[PDB]
Amino acid sequence: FDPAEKYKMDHRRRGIALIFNHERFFWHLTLPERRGTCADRDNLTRRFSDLGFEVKCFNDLKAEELLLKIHEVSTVSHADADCFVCVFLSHGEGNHIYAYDAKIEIQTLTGLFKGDKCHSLVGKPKIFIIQACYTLPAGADFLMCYSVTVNGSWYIQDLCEMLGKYGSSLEFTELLTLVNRKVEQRVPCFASMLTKKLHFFPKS
Amino acid sequence: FDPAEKYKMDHRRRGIALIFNHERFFWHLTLPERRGTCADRDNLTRRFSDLGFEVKCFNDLKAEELLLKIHEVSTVSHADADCFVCVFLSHGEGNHIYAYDAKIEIQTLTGLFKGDKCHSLVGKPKIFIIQACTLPAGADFLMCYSVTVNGSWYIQDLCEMLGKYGSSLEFTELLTLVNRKVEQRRQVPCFASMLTKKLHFFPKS
């Protein structure tokens, strides 16, 4: 029973990094524009591509479209993939994220990737990064990263900076730990249901 | 800016490990007895002593006594201590823990150790382990959630890991093993970290 066991990260593909980016909102929600979220979006796009991810961004989806998209991604095959990354950059009321027109419960989004529902991701890391102005990991191998101006937000800037230097070498949670320190110096948080060490060594 | 930076762990003392152990409850709460929580309590007592902690156990405190105790511990000096550990073994409705007679919000308990309120713990790890049938209060907080007569799976497996690897491994990687151990049983626990540095318990001088 090896205390230095790492997740298997030598599949054909790294996997998908889903980015839902929300800048403006339906007028009757009365939510302020999120200035520099697009900078965050692009920054995350660079960093994650560099780590081998197929990055798919969507901007300002309405609830229906977002659920369609995420449900779709939950149902393609991840059998030849290492892991899955999903990012939300929007407003958040409670355990909800905002789409363009309405709230969605985070649990209903994350639950799409639990084992009973997404077989090809079983025993692989499922990483959610949630940057929102609450929800425990959906199950085994889930990692939730919470953040708790025109050039981006502190959390995404510092996460991306760390991904840039250390992403290819460090264990991912120790890298988040650095992000905690970085941000604090200028507090964010991760919650882990991971079962092994996670690294993003460059692929063959 | 060193990515391998560890917390300073060479103070005079390791620190206190507070254990609030709850087995029976006031009748009108209608909460079932927690069988084998005493086993858990004793198991945690061994492991934490072995790691250099001054362990103080309290059994079935009523809300007033619990608050008094924890507020007291939050107000002694930790200046010559490495860190602080506090364990709750009780029932939990929401972000509440149960004392003997009532609920208490976990935030009001953790909040006592935030920097603005407990100066001698600033920049030191504050670890809460909650085993109950809330996000970290601030920097350097680590929350461990478990989410029969010989103990619970979570405490057994956490204690077994503390015993083998506690003196050696980085504490979060140790918790990760506990996630794997508990998962193997034929539930999935969790930790949430606001730690800023690597945490080790290496035997003290």
From Swiss-Prot, chain B:
GO MF term list = cysteine-type endopeptidase activity; cysteine-type peptidase activity; identical protein binding
Which residues are annotated as modified residue Phosphoserine in the UniProt record?
A: 49, 183
Q: Per the record, what is the consequence of mutating residue 190 to S?
A: Reduced palmitoylation, leading to increased cysteine protease activity
Q: Residues in the active site?
A: 91, 133
Annotated EC: 3.4.22.59
Q: Does the keyword Aminoacyl-tRNA synthetase apply?
A: no
Q: What is known of its domains?
A: The N-terminal disordered prodomain is required to prevent self-activation.
In Swiss-Prot or TrEMBL terms, this protein is called Caspase-6
Which source organism does the UniProt entry give? Homo sapiens (Human)
